[PDB]
Design a protein around this ligand. Sequence first.
Ligand SMILES: Nc1ncnc2c1ncn2[C@@H]1O[C@H](COP(=O)(O)OP(=O)(O)O)[C@@H](O)[C@H]1O
Ligand SMILES: Nc1ncnc2c1ncn2[C@@H]1O[C@H](COP(=O)(O)OP(=O)(O)O)[C@@H](O)[C@H]1O
Ligand SMILES: Nc1ncnc2c1ncn2[C@@H]1O[C@H](COP(=O)(O)OP(=O)(O)O)[C@@H](O)[C@H]1O
Ligand SMILES: Nc1ncnc2c1ncn2[C@@H]1O[C@H](COP(=O)(O)OP(=O)(O)O)[C@@H](O)[C@H]1O
Ligand SMILES: [Mg+2]
Ligand SMILES: [Mg+2]
Ligand SMILES: [Mg+2]
Ligand SMILES: [Mg+2]
Lengths: 183, 183, 183, 183, 183, 183
Amino acid sequence: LSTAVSTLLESGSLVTVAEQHPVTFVRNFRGLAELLKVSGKMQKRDWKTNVHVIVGPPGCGKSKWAANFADPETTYWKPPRNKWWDGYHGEEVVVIDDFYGWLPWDDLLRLCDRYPLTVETKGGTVPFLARSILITSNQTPLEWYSSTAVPAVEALYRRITSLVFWKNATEQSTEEGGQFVTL
Amino acid sequence: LSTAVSTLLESGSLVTVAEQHPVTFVRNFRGLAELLKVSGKMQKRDWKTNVHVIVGPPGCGKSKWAANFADPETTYWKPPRNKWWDGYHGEEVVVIDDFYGWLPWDDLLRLCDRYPLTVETKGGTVPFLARSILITSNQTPLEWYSSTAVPAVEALYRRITSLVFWKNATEQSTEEGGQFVTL
Amino acid sequence: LSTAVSTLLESGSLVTVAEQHPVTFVRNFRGLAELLKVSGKMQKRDWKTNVHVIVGPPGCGKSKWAANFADPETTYWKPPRNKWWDGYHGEEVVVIDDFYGWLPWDDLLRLCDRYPLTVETKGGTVPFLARSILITSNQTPLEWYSSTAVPAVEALYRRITSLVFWKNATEQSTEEGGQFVTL
Amino acid sequence: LSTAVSTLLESGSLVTVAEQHPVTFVRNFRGLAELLKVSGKMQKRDWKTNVHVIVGPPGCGKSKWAANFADPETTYWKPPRNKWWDGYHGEEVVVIDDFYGWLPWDDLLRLCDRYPLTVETKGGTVPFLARSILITSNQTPLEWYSSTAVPAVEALYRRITSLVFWKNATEQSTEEGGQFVTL
Amino acid sequence: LSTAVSTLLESGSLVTVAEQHPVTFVRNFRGLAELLKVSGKMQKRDWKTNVHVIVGPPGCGKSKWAANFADPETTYWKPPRNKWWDGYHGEEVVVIDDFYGWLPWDDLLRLCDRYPLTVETKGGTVPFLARSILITSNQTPLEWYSSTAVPAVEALYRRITSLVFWKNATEQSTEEGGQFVTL
Amino acid sequence: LSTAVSTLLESGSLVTVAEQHPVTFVRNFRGLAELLKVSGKMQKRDWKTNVHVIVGPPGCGKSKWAANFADPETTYWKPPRNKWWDGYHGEEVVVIDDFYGWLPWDDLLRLCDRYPLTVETKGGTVPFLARSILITSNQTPLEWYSSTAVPAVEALYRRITSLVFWKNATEQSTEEGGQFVTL
DNA sequence: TTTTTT
Ligand SMILES: Nc1ncnc2c1ncn2[C@@H]1O[C@H](COP(=O)(O)OP(=O)(O)O)[C@@H](O)[C@H]1O
Ligand SMILES: Nc1ncnc2c1ncn2[C@@H]1O[C@H](COP(=O)(O)OP(=O)(O)O)[C@@H](O)[C@H]1O
Ligand SMILES: Nc1ncnc2c1ncn2[C@@H]1O[C@H](COP(=O)(O)OP(=O)(O)O)[C@@H](O)[C@H]1O
Ligand SMILES: Nc1ncnc2c1ncn2[C@@H]1O[C@H](COP(=O)(O)OP(=O)(O)O)[C@@H](O)[C@H]1O
Ligand SMILES: [Mg+2]
Ligand SMILES: [Mg+2]
Ligand SMILES: [Mg+2]
Ligand SMILES: [Mg+2]
């Protein structure tokens, strides 16, 4: 356990302690996470996270493309209508699926901002090291959060990387331009 | 417990650990489960979950067909009226009984899909992997939800794999999908 | 403990362990309940919970008969009006007392079915295993729930086993479902 | 520990253990609680709880009589306008202070009844074991509740054991039977 | 921790246990809370609370004399317009600031009585043991509540131990208390 | 160990405890947190909070000026149009944006006073320690309320420190404050 | 954490 802290407080936690020291992590699993969170070494983030937004009527393979995006080993699916990010003890595809506006708008913005973040799970907090958020929906992206219920709708628009609509029941087409309020 | 951790590392199932070495699994059960979560060898889902829907007036014998279907030992009779799936911890009949829509719409769509999902318990989250869901009702699925308060109701009918009915005081005659609505 | 776990895995009931060696159940009590949940030997229900309904104006001795139906060591008196089956860790008799309709309709339909059920306790889940639900009321089962606001009022009546009624200020006489809407 | 388990399982609730071997109750406290709840010997109430109402205009030394009815070690003064019984853990005499009608009717009946009951606390449940409910009030029991919203007001008066009143005299005089409805 | 228990059962305050024993409170911090809560001996109010109503038009240092009452540290400041006494943790001075009547009339009649009470906090209840309730206001105690809405009605104007007005922009003159209804 | 408490009682911060002695912070972390939360008095406030009102015609670069008052990383941007200061931890710029009269009058008068206050989130309370409140509005502070509904009625302007205005497309001019009702 | 709380 003396060596356990030494390995823990280098980088890349807790995945590498659990890989390297399996026995000592069966015990103290709450405490290693608390020590790491207390110190300023939770592997923070400085990269603008990519946001891909998909729109199309159901049955048009919205989520199929999200599944076929990166390796399934390194993919997380946000369970909807639930503000708990349990299961994020790996990382870095995050596919919030089948959206209808069920997240607090400010937090949704915070996930799409550039600053570091720490989401909360059942039994502590976990750093949010995302690189591509595939926000998959079925409706127009504007309607998710009403303009009266939001201080500024354009703030959400600013951090979108790319957007995809659906064509006349044949093709997935990429939306390019200012058909709606652009960024 | 080093043997127990190694025999968890490759098998990746707490059920096996509890079968082999109960004593260690009794003393440190949060630790083993969290180690399994962090090491990434969890059990995601990549298969379509069949949704057999039974409809009939009460007393006709809907639920006895669910209670005899797969095995008395591998069916999880879902606790009703609430979003808690406690005690589930693996496997693969999930029988939501006596349903009339008392589950959130988006979550009911998400239970009946091919892509992964973590489901919520009193203490944390247990991954969802169901090879077949049996839904028992008194109304037809056309009126489980408000057809106006739901954006696109075709996205539920598209997931049901078989809609079994009750005919005029004779038997449970399986209906054929795609006739009255999609299936 | 090494023997206590052995008893637990094959008795299938934490009550047994709690009575044999309490001292090794005072410690490691979460562990045993989680081994029992994982191993699958947690006890389900597959029998029919025969439901007795008692009616009569107040003070006529409804509750006394309910306390004289089984040993007080086993009768679990349901807490009123608040849908929390706390204090239940089993055994046969359940006396929901002084009933007037303070339970959701589907829960009253589903307690009395023959198939497994899990009830909520205050921060957990308890499996339901009763063999007799003595409902005690001042009103006939008609006046528990309004007919219009109920999918089918005949569903509850099918599950009532016996109906004892107080008449003519002498003594309560068992009914046979003739005058009442029969079962 | 087996001494603590002796004093617990043989007879009583956690209070007796707390009074006998505190150093064995600062440790193992959650597990003694679960052993008690699973053993089944958690003290029910099988007796009749006397109900002494006190009526008098504000300032007549109403509550002085209640605080002098029994030793302050065994008086639980219920907080007002709540359904919560927090902190109770068994306190023989229960003085509902200045009670103008802020408790549900059937719940007030069940407190004054003579058969088991488990009252609710913030995040748990506690078995009711009172023996003398002193209902200090301002009006006669005929003004606590209205006959419109009540099945039958006699159903409460049947349980008021004694009834002290204040009239135009410095003494408090008991009520011999009922000039109003009989108790 | 033998000394810690004997010190806790006498002083009845966890803060004292921590200060007189840091090391053995870092471990067994939950157990000491449960031992205190179950054993009894919790410090309950058995004295009279000394109400000091401070009244005058705004800007005259109503709050200045409120915080002047020693100490600046041991003075709970009641949250405005609210029900929950959150975080109170045991003080001796309670300064309800800038009152209008927001606390229910009966709750204010009960805060100033001479008997134990249990206030509500968001997640539990905390015993209320206060020796002076500085009710800063802007009106006299006559017009805090409507003349007819109060049913008692002379039960607040009994317990007002002190009173201070503010005269014509000169100084805070202690009201003699005789002109109004007596205190 | 023992020296952890020695280094905690002379720091007042857990961060240094983790830095110098992490090995005994991986264990016992819950108890150091409770010890700090129970031995150190909650942080009150005694400092007049500056209230810089920003007013102008809509869209005049008000929000950028608001963020430019101090560091955005320690700036709140209170969720508008409700009464839940979702913690935010104490963050000592407070920018209430687009205020147009929706907080209660006395609550706003209290938020800008020299004496402690505790705003409430959902499921708890957070101490309110703000060195600056930035009320960004649309129209004059006298139109936020009418003098009929507000029986103070000029008590807010004492609390306003300064005023920032936008003249006819020149700049965000800082108000004299000497023409209108004084500051 | 869930419960409570909203
Ligand atoms: N192995 C497979 N075989 C056949 N079809 C597949 C397979 N995997 C994915 N699909 C198709 O992917 C589509 C996913 O679309 P959909 O279920 O509408 O997404 P969502 O429900 O998230 O909007 C389905 O129409 C399904 O037919
Ligand atoms: N002991 C028995 N004897 C005869 N029939 C029975 C018995 N137990 C159950 N049944 C039948 O089994 C069927 C299924 O029971 P149940 O699942 O409670 O009804 P439902 O199908 O309406 O949910 C009912 O139609 C009932 O008549
Ligand atoms: N041990 C006993 N000895 C004598 N009489 C008893 C005993 N237990 C109960 N009783 C009688 O039984 C009756 C039960 O009353 P109660 O439970 O209020 O009826 P209900 O709950 O049906 O209205 C009481 O009136 C009481 O006189
Ligand atoms: N410990 C005590 N010492 C002195 N007097 C007391 C004590 N306890 C109660 N009293 C007296 O009892 C009376 C109780 O009055 P109060 O509680 O206001 O009315 P009620 O009891 O009708 O609510 C007071 O006038 C007080 O003088
Ligand atoms: Mg979808
Ligand atoms: Mg059924
Ligand atoms: Mg009864
Ligand atoms: Mg009183």
